[PDB]
Structure 1
Amino acid sequence: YRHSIFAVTHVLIPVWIIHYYLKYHVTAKPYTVVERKPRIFPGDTILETGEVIPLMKEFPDQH
C-alpha cells in the first residue's frame, strides 16, 4: 500500500506534467526537441516511404 501510493505521488504525477509540458508546449516551438536521426542499414524498409534500401555488393564470403 505504501509503495503503490508513493509511486503515484512521486513518479506518476511528475511524468504526467512533464509529458504534457513537452508534448504541448516545448515541441510547439521549432527545434526545441531534436533527435539524432536513426541509423539506416542496407535492407531496411521505411514506414513513411515503404521502399527498401538496396542490398550490399555481395563481397566474396569465405571464413
Structure 2
Amino acid sequence: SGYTPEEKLRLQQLRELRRRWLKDQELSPREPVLPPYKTYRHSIFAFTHVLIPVWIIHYYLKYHVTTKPYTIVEKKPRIFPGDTILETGEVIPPMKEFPDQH
C-alpha cells in the first residue's frame, strides 16, 4: 500500500525544495534594518488621564451644564426623624415611642 517508486522520488524532491525555502525565511542578524520609576509613570498617567480630564469636565459641568435648568437633577436627600436641616436649622421631630418589644 506504500508509495510507488515514482511518488517517493517526487516527495523527496519537493521536500528538499521546501526545507530550503523554509530555511530562507529566517532573518539575518542585521534584519530588520530599521531607519534612524513606576511611581513616576503612574504619576504621569494620573495627571494626563484623570486630573486634566476631571478639570475639563468640572469646568464643563460647573459653568455650562449647571447654568441651564434641569440639566443635573439630584434625588433629594433622605430626611430621617431627628435629622437637622442645614439650610434652615429646622429640627425634624423624632418618631413616637415604640412598644419596645424585643
TM-score (norm 1): 0.95
Report sequence identity in percent.
92
Give the match's secondary structure for 2:72.
Answer: coil
Name stretches of at least 5 consecutive residues in structure 1 with no aligned partner. none
Cα offset, 1:57, TM superposition: 1.0
Cα offset, 1:28, TM superposition: 0.6
Question: Which has the greater radius of gyration?
Answer: 2
C-alpha separation between the residues in 1 aligned to 2:49 and 2:96? Answer: 54
4+ runs of 1 displaced by more than 3 Å? none
Size of the aligned set, in residue pairs, is 63
C-alpha separation between the residues in 2 aligned to 1:53 and 1:44? Answer: 5
Judging by fraction of residues, say which structure has more helix: 2
C-alpha separation between the residues in 1 aligned to 2:48 and 2:77? Answer: 35
Larger RCO, structure (CA 8 Å, separation 6 or more): 1
Name stretches of at least 5 consecutive residues in structure 2 with no aligned partner. 1-39
Partner of 2:56: 17
Cα offset, 1:48, TM superposition: 0.7
